[PDB]
Symmetry: C2
Subunit: 162 residues, 2 copies
């Protein structure tokens, strides 16, 4: 980790498992490369597409949040599987999936419009900034979405691993 950087291509079966509970037309995350930082932070670099809205007939805050959830569940599952999630290095994906996954709660969530993002196709990324005990793990994360034309938005989300 100080010597190399772990980096993983999209995990298609993990991605479909993540997306399985969503309505067909609310499935937006399409690919996700997972990394670890020199300091042990888990990062996801993702692509997204919204061919049609999920809940109502640019990229809006509802969709920003749906996309985060998907990106966040994927990154968490894939990081635990590959030993990159601070706090869970002694856990396996199994133990985590049925026991921690359900009890991930978004404690706080925030989004900010910068330039309108084309909902049809656009990129995103997120970081586990910190993980900290509080008898639960409190994790800060940051995220950002962009397209091929300066569209951008971003924000943060504090997670509680119960």
């Amino acid at each position: 980790r100080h010597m190399t950087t772990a980096q993983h291509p999209t995990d298609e079966d993990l991605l479909a498992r993540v997306l399985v509970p969503y309505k067909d037309h609310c499935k937006y995350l399409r690919s996700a490369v997972v990394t670890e930082s020199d300091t042990g932070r888990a990062v996801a670099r993702c692509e997204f597409a919204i061919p049609e809205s999920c809940y109502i007939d640019h990229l809006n805050s509802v969709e920003v949040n749906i996309c985060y959830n998907q990106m966040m569940y994927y990154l968490v599952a894939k990081s635990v599987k590959e030993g990159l999630l601070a706090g869970f290095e002694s856990w396996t994906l199994d133990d985590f999936w049925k026991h921690q996954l359900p009890d991930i709660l978004i404690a706080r969530f925030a989004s900010n419009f910068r330039r309108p993002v084309n909902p049809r196709a656009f990129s995103g990324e997120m970081e586990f900034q910190s993980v900290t005990r509080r008898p639960f793990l409190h994790a800060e994360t940051a995220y950002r979405y962009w397209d091929a034309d300066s569209g951008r938005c971003d924000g943060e989300a504090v997670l509680a691993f119960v």
Copy 2:
């Protein structure tokens, strides 16, 4: 103190998918300082986008309630046709935020929102800037709250 306007309510709810229409009643009022407030009831019978009240649903409830509050505010001055056609699609949430304090029951819960400041800005096209805040609560300690900045 304006009671739910069922005509307006349905107009606000019309673009949403059936399993995504949460706002049931919405009493509108003005603080004596002219701030527009909406005391609302909600229900999330089915879920809209997936299998407690989560941040996606907090944000959908917010939009429904905020559009209702705005449209009714115009309708009482705080023409809809003009607004509905011209201004109402140029409402942009510039920032949104939510905080979950105690788990809220999504089948039945209450909420409130208000326009805290509305300021004209001219950076660069002139436009109205609004700071809003909202809270949700249920009958049993449930609460979450947050803020949204709007641009007209």
